[PDB]
Amino acid sequence: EIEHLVQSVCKSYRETCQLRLEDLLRQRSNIFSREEVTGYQRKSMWEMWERCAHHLTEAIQYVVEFAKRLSGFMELCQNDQIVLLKAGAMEVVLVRMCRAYNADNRTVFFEGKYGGMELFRALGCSELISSIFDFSHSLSALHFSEDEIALYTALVLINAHRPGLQEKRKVEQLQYNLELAFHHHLCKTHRQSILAKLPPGKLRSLCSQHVERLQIFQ
């Protein structure tokens, strides 16, 4: 039953999102002072990367837990479970941060409060931080429901075209099932128009430039 899988994806998503959606929205009034922004900008590139690296690592463990709890995934061979997570975990982290993004004031939720891209200046990757805000702004524009983002992030993960898959049929099958679920659920709710406004490799290319940098922080 497609309906079991849908309820499973939504359950796991509800249980594995690091921050509650009510808490992010209640916190949108809480914005970093220019003093606080100065404090972050003053930090060494080493310090800012270590502290962001730490946050990213923690987030990936929530995507790992999201994958493990969503049944059909645990039935794939361990090799394929590893290939899909390493290929998609960060892309899933990126999609998720659009919930912690306020398009009203181009702010993202970060270590307790909200701030703009100028907070991350010490990373010395303004291009990349701009890519991340732009992508979050585009995604916020869809006004996803929790169910829509749960099902979308499941398809970000269950992708039969990832290189290095052993049982490429068993992944196609799960992906095809998630597609039927997602397409049916959008069509039944007249939400099918958002499929045009979804990014293409654009999740892949976004982080390519800077990602293997994280290995020397851990």
Ligand SMILES: CNC(=O)[C@@H]1CCCN1C(=O)c1ccc(Cl)c(COc2cccc3c(C(F)(F)F)cc(C)nc23)c1Cl
């Ligand atoms: C408690 N946890 C949190 O609040 C969450 C976890 C995910 C977002 N987050 C942050 O604290 C956080 C919030 C906003 C931003 Cl802009 C950032 C910094 O983001 C990144 C900086 C460097 C590299 C990043 C890269 C790449 F791929 F480049 F590593 C990729 C992604 C997607 N984000 C990068 C971070 Cl680390």
